[PDB]
Amino acid sequence: SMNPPPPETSNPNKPKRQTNQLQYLLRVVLKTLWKHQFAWPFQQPVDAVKLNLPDYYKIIKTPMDMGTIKKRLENNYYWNAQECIQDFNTMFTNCYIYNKPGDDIVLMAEALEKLFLQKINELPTE
Numbered sequence: 001s002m003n004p005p006p007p008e009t010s011n012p013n014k015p016k017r018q019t020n021q022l023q024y025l026l027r028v029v030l031k032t033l034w035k036h037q038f039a040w041p042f043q044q045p046v047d048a049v050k051l052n053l054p055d056y057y058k059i060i061k062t063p064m065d066m067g068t069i070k071k072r073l074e075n076n077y078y079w080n081a082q083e084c085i086q087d088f089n090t091m092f093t094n095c096y097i098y099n100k101p102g103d104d105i106v107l108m109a110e111a112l113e114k115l116f117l118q119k120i121n122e123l124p125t126e
């Protein structure tokens with residue numbers, strides 16, 4: 001089996017900004033989720049070869065992971081916070097699409113998503 005190339009984390013012709021909302025997404029949101037006991041399945045792209053999930057990238061056509069999001073934030077890849085929030089939501093949604101309800105990995109995603117929602121509830125204005 002083969003994995004696909006990972007999502008891009010740098011693109012010199014993509015316009016970039018560093019806003020206070022994006023700084024919050026790195027310093028508060030990403031850092032809170034990254035240190036969590038349940039973060040580890042989400043800290044890198046799914047290696048469907050090593051995990052013996054040959055159908056993963058047949059089902060998941062918009063992969064996303066926190067390793068990618070971390071690199072994007074540290075590279076100032078984004079223009080606005082909504083782009084980054086969409087990446088997080090894609091990662092959670094992919095987990096719920098691929099896995100069975102009640103699987104341990106789904107419980108892990110739900111726990112991270114609850115914290116995610118609590119932090120973005122206080123996303124600073126501007």
Ligand SMILES: CC(=O)c1cc(-c2cc(C(=O)NC3CC3)ccc2C)c2ncccn12
Pocket residue numbers: 040041042044045046047048050051094095098099105
């Ligand atoms: C997000 C998702 O659905 C998901 C993630 C994992 C997962 C991936 C890795 C991994 O790829 N590590 C790379 C370094 C080699 C490791 C451990 C786990 C539990 C998983 N395993 C079974 C079903 C679903 N998943």
